[PDB]
Amino acid sequence: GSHMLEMGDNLLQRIRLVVPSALQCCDGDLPIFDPQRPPARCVFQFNGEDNVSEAFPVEYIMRLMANWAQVDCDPYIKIQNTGVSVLFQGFFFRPTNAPVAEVSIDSNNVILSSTLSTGINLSALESIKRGGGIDRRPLQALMWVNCFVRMPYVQLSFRFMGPEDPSRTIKLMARATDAYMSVYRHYFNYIARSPPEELATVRGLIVPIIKTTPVTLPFNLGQTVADNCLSLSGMGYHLGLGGYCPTCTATDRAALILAYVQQLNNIYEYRVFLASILALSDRASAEPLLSSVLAQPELFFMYHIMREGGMRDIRVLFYRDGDAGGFMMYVIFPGKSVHLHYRLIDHIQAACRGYKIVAHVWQTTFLLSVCRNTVVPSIGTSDVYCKMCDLNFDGELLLEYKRLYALFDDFVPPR
Numbered sequence: 067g068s069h070m071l072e073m074g075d076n077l078l079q080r081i082r083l084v085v086p087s088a089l090q091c092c093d094g095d096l097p098i099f100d101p102q103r104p105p106a107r108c109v110f111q112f113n114g115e116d117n118v119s120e121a122f123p124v125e126y127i128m129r130l131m132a133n134w135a136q137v138d139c140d141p142y143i144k145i146q147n148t149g150v151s152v153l154f155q156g157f158f159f160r161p162t163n164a165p166v167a168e169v170s171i172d173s174n175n176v177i178l179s180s181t182l183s184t185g186i187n188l189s190a191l192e193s194i195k196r197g198g199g200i201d202r203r204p205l206q207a208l209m210w211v212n213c214f215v216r217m218p219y220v221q222l223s224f225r226f227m228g229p230e231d232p233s234r235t236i237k238l239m240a241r242a243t244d245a246y247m248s249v250y251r252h253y254f255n256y257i258a259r260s261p262p263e264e265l266a267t268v269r270g271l272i273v274p275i276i277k278t279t280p281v282t283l284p285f286n287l288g289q290t291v292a293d294n295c296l297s298l299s300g301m302g303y304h305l306g307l308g309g310y311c312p313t314c315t316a317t318d319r320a321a322l323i324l325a326y327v328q329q330l331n332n333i334y335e336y337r338v339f340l341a342s343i344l345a346l347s348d349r350a351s352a353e354p355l356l357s358s359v360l361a362q363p364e365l366f367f368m369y370h371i372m373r374e375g376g377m378r379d380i381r382v383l384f385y386r387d388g389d390a391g392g393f394m395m396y397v398i399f400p401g402k403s404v405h406l407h408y409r410l411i412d413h414i415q416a417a418c419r420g421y422k423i424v425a426h427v428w429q430t431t432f433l434l435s436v437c438r439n440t441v442v443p444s445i446g447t448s449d450v451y452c453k454m455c456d457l458n459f460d461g462e463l464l465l466e467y468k469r470l471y472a473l474f475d476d477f478v479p480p481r
């Protein structure tokens with residue numbers, strides 16, 4: 067009689083239970099759910115507002131739904147950029163032409179533009195799980211989707227999470243199988259009796275199973291998400307999770323434009339910037355060259371952000387951009403290792419919108435290439451040229467730029 071209505075509500079309530087509150091439930095008017103005839107329409111919806119950074123327990127919800135259904139199904143969850151928010155939409159079967167993300171353990175990031183969407187179903191999730199050798203024991207490794215709502219964009223990351231205490235989870239599955247006497251069914255029937263213990267269990271999957279991921283150079287920083295850091299060294303090329311990176315754990319558009327028009331003041335701050343233009347003047351007056359580089363204020367933004375972020379010993383090289391005109395810039399890192407804090411990557415991406423930032427390695431030197439793909443008030447070229455004449459430059463600095471321009475004259479950004 068009423069049982070069927072109760073079975074469906076118990077499901078949706080347990081789903082809403084495990085979804086963090088920042089992703090607000092926004093379901094409409096839903097019908098009665100028949101386990102033997104699961105619906106094909108959308109069964110739940112959760113919404114994340116702009117600037118939200120939260121994780122969705124995609125795998126747990128999928129397996130909960132598969133456990134509820136008394137027939138074969140392939141739970142599918144669609145992740146959509148609404149233009150003002152991220153929208154998670156759940157289904158028992160993937161709609162006809164719904165998208166499925168092409169992700170793996172190592173390539174796990176997805177960036178959605180405005181109005182676009184991606185998705186994933188339990189079948190694809192399981193395939194990714196068995197290809198990466200992930201632990202398949204129930205509750206040892208479940209996938210979540212970390213979302214960083216950064217309108218007009220939505221950043222996603224498909225990550226496998228695990229328990230802080232695996233032994234505490236092996237014992238839970240031991241008590242669940244005892245009461246019952248796949249193995250997931252034992253857990254879901256047991257945990258159905260204690261919503262509090264179910265919440266505590268899902269909220270306990272908070273240990274990333276893959277804290278670092280390899281990348282291939284050249285690496286476009288546009289493939290990162292807001293909490294990704296980047297490490298380049300003799301240990302390889304890796305993306306990290308800002309929260310779980312030991313190095314990491316250890317200014318809007320206005321302030322950037324304000325820094326460009328106020329560069330003449332605190333001339334020492336970008337002494338290293340002007341010294342590059344001197345060294346570039348030799349090879350082939352310097353005033354028309356200085357004007358061209360200042361016509362690309364994003365290049366100054368990058369240099370300003372790098373040093374505000376602690377990367378004080380960087381060097382910048384300017385090369386004519388054959389395609390877009392003007393100049394591209396190489397940020398040369400010192401030494402044989404570099405770590406870009408996740409906050410720094412976020413900053414340089416926002417500051418240089420319209421420019422591609424790509425990490426390279428050339429002649430034992432790590433670098434970023436900044437190539438062109440809101441008006442900034444122009445400054446007086448002559449005002450900067452005159453300050454450049456009065457500035458003093460040590461020979462070591464000028465020789466450094468001599469060696470660097472000679473070293474990178476043969477460097478060709480793959481693009």
Ligand SMILES: [Zn+2]
Pocket residue numbers: 295296306307308311312313314315405406407408
């Ligand atoms: Zn880091």
